Design a protein around this ligand. Structure first.
Ligand SMILES: O=c1[nH]cc(F)c(=O)[nH]1
Ligand SMILES: [Cl-]
Length: 229
């Protein structure tokens, strides 16, 4: 359960545990960081058992990578899959409402029934953030505290697989992963982040879902079924 106390082989899916071996010590250090935050009287999100949740879906099955900045800052929202919320959450966070507006515009599907993105994760979409924890109410508060090396390692490992990869990089912090995607089996879509602060700079109209599927087909891979219930 605890990333200070237990190894990657217990915390994440088998392929991910091997993929993340270069950062095994760093993940334990992040567990120590979180312990120190609590000792100091600061909290973090998502819940400890969810921090590495994106790495519990199989590494070998990832076809598309979505990367945001850091988890939702409001207690009760972040679940360890970027942008997702529990199926009983309403209203939707503003960034997610914006994502879903673009989803309907791009794909023509009706608005989803809820904000649970687990179907995407179950269909080969990795829902990552550049940084995997945040202090409540304080976006970007864990920037530069050691998660970047972990998520860098994850992207490098995905990019090294003998497989096509499409990355969707939402926002500035996600965009720092672009250099690691240089190899010919990988292609990146970059746009402004879907938060209200930046969505009108190019997130709306970006059509990332249909573009990712055109890219997958062009590499000989199966497209994602993006349809949410
Ligand atoms: O960049 C992000 N913003 C909001 C989120 F919930 C998330 O996971 N990532
Ligand atoms: Cl706090």
């Amino acid at each position: 359960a605890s990333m200070t106390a237990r190894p990657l082989s217990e915390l994440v899916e088998r392929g991910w545990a091997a993929a993340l071996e270069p950062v095994a010590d760093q993940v334990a250090h992040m567990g120590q960081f979180l312990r120190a935050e609590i000792a100091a009287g600061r909290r973090y999100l998502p819940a400890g058992s969810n921090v590495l949740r994106a790495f519990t879906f199989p590494f070998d099955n990832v076809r598309v990578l979505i990367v945001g900045q850091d988890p939702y800052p409001t207690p009760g929202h972040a679940v360890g899959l970027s942008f997702s919320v529990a199926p009983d959450v309403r209203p939707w966070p503003r960034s997610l409402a914006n994502i879903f507006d673009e989803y309907t515009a791009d794909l023509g599907y009706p608005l989803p029934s809820n904000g649970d993105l687990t179907p995407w994760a179950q269909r080969g979409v990795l829902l990552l953030n550049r940084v995997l924890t945040v202090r409540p109410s304080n976006p970007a508060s864990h920037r530069g505290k050691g998660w970047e090396a972990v998520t860098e390692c994850a992207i490098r490992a995905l990019a090294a697989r003998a497989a096509p990869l499409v990355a969707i990089l939402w926002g500035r912090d996600a965009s720092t992963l672009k250099p690691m995607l240089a190899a010919g089996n990988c292609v990146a879509i970059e746009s402004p982040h879907p938060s209200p602060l930046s969505a009108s700079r190019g997130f709306f109209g970006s059509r990332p879902f249909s573009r990712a599927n055109e890219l997958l087909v062009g590499m000989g891979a199966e497209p994602i079924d993006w349809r949410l219930p």
